[model samples]
Target: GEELFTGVVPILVELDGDVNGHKFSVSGEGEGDATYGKLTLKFICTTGKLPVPWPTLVTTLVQCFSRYPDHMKQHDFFKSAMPEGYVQERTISFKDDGNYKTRAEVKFEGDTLVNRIELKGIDFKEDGNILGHKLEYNFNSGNVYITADKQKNGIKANFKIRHNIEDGSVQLADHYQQNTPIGDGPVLLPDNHYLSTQSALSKDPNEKRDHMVLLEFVTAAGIT
Candidate 1:
């Protein structure tokens, strides 16, 4: 038989670098094994800088929950609904050594406590990359969490283009015009364009109606 009760656990991490910060301090409680338990993982970055904007922030966070060998599962939901890639190798080790690899690394810095959690055996370089970033976890009550306080400014930008074809021409001719801002900005918005106000009017009904869509994009630099 399983016992159930209620309890709380608070996790604190004190980071060691300029990006030291607190994270995932939210409280959670649940019933299990005749007792309720709660866990809180908190991080306080000193510089308050985030590794990626809010979109990337959500992506990296969700990646923590992914199972090894499933690349699609590792993708961040807020970034794109689709999985970016597949994870080829998967391993989980308990011991610390060359044989025991790291899956992720998460840390926190606060006035009272400095803490870090290392996820091991989940390391693999993506494509030509040398090493994959580490994943870290902080548990609160029963819920788990992680955080990064540095902005990923180096992410490559993806742009979108449009072209016009006319006169029942069999051949399609096009030209590269304006570039779309990568990430969730224009795509989520109604018109797929950045609008200053919802009431703003456009000459084309398609463009105007497109304003009905709302999308938001956050850079890693702004996630703190």
Candidate 2:
């Protein structure tokens, strides 16, 4: 040991959690085994607790598992698939006008696709910025989840879609829950057939079940 290698220290009682050959903190043979990954309250970066070199994913990148609402992975997939082509750009309407500047895009590599997005200004951000503005998860039954960030709101809600899968038709979720289907832009129906309909919602203003965004939020002149 050199002068620094054998440097005298005022500290004693070193500890580690089996980083090197030693697995236990109370070492009887190698006294200096506790020097690196301080056993209990360990945070110092050392090869502590690892029998060999750090595994492939001692750290990992952001990722997404099945059914994960990770648009990053989704977008990255499109980007990778269409890896060579003239890029295409697109813009979407604001979640609510005077609220967002959400500009979406699609880049192509020949026939592949790629994209990135940004929503600036809290007043100028999309609901896509927040959660869906709700990112839910259902890990117990449907599919396992993993993401590049693994960023979760700590909820156990199953992420469910509410559109027509077979035909992309729209309807009131509860008003016509599993109701009859409608025609595409009105087809000629039989003379004997009469169209049936149910009020999807009450027009009463007081009932706030299917509430829309409040456009009348009064901001008091105060701190920014």
Candidate 3:
């Protein structure tokens, strides 16, 4: 008899209930042992004293079902679709022993669809604060104007990041001229609609008549 293999894997224990009955689920990891021996297994439910017909379980079920809509609202799709001309702001501060302490602030304008993120940190060498803008756009003169650096089109990113460890410095990284588009300009919006609006209009055919008025402006404005 000798031990052969030893490893761990994810395990899920589910207690499915009958109709109108209670259900429970537990999740954890399991370790297995293998050897040349007869395996014995026993499963039993020990006796426990009940305390006054527990109603908390039923109450929790009702609470969760009722709050399902609220949970759905927490998603980005719902949260981002705010009222027009609304201003939303959020702040968060986090700290760890070895990692830097960070304070992040975000400001979002619903109407113009602009968002700004401000990052401040401690335990840094050269700069303690970093300011960045994301998904910034403006609706001006019956058109959408998106402002981005070096790169243009969908999922565009351009920035330089400096990193340092507690000892000295790690590396300085530069991300520039990156443009990724899903399909033809992020889901085929109208010429003046999305982040890559200018680029989309550049290749648009006048016969397609997607945006007659907007494309005219795009052409006259010399936007490539």
Candidate 4:
């Protein structure tokens, strides 16, 4: 009792100051004749940036990673491995008046096979407003394949999302695929990695914060 089709949908993120808030959450749910499913992903920040500044903001933002020391390793690794003459910049825009309409840009320098990573048109308000932002990565040396996965109940979808991070672009790379087993990819930290799941956080008094809110959303999808 279902139809069949195959296609790929790409999702992107635009970096805007307005997007800076409590958390970044994604979720979806669906049901079919005899099946039901859900998926959820969240990015929490103890502190987020406001009214984006230049290199200083980038440094400040980078400091937040101290909570997740492993993330710092990932950033450092990526920066070191990048080719020479390559540069990374974080840019943001603000409204003339007083409001939460700001933009953030991440730019790369040089003329390698991989050009840059750019995202724009994002909002920072906590009202769940979707902005037109793109996600991209450049590789001047080797071949890379970027794939996407999405799913609903009995239906599944997988496709290639653009892997280039250039200036003035937006793509949607957030979706779920059915029946795909998620893998434990590379961790930012070396061997001593620390991750606090619900089970663990529930037991630790130090982990509990009054203002800190935990949100759980479900998406009817997975990735293999």
Best by TM-score: 1
lDDT of 3 at 118: 21
Writing each residue's lDDT as its tens digit, candidate 1 over 1-224 gives 00001122122322221111222221111111102111122222233433211111111121111221222212222122112211111122212211112121221122111122221212322321112113221111111121211132111211211111122212111111111112322111111111110111112244321111111122121111
Which structure is stronger by TM-score: 2 or 3? 3
Kindly give the number of clashing pairs for every candidate.
57, 22, 0, 35
| Segments in model 2 whose C-alpha atoms lie over 4 Å from true places | 1-99, 124-135, 138-224
Q: Which has the better TM-score: candidate 1, or candidate 2?
A: 1
Locate the minimum summed-lDDT window of 10 residues in model 3. 57-66
Evaluated at residue 13, the lDDT of candidate 2 is 18
Candidate 2 TM-score versus the reference: 0.17
Q: What is the TM-score of each candidate against the true structure?
A: 0.19, 0.17, 0.17, 0.17
Candidate 3, residue 158: the lDDT equals 31
Question: Model 1: what TM-score?
Answer: 0.19
Question: Each candidate: what lDDT?
Answer: 0.19, 0.18, 0.19, 0.21
The list of candidate 1 runs beyond 4 A from truth reads 1-6, 14-42, 54-115, 118-224
Cα lDDT of model 4 overall?
Answer: 0.21
User: Which is better, 1 or 4, measured by TM-score?
Assistant: 1
**Model 4, C-alpha of 168: deviation from truth (Å):** 29
Regions more than 4 Å wrong, model 4: 1-42, 45-119, 122-159, 162-224
lDDT per residue, candidate 2, 107-177, as tens digits?
32232122222222233223232212221111111111111211221111111112121233321111110
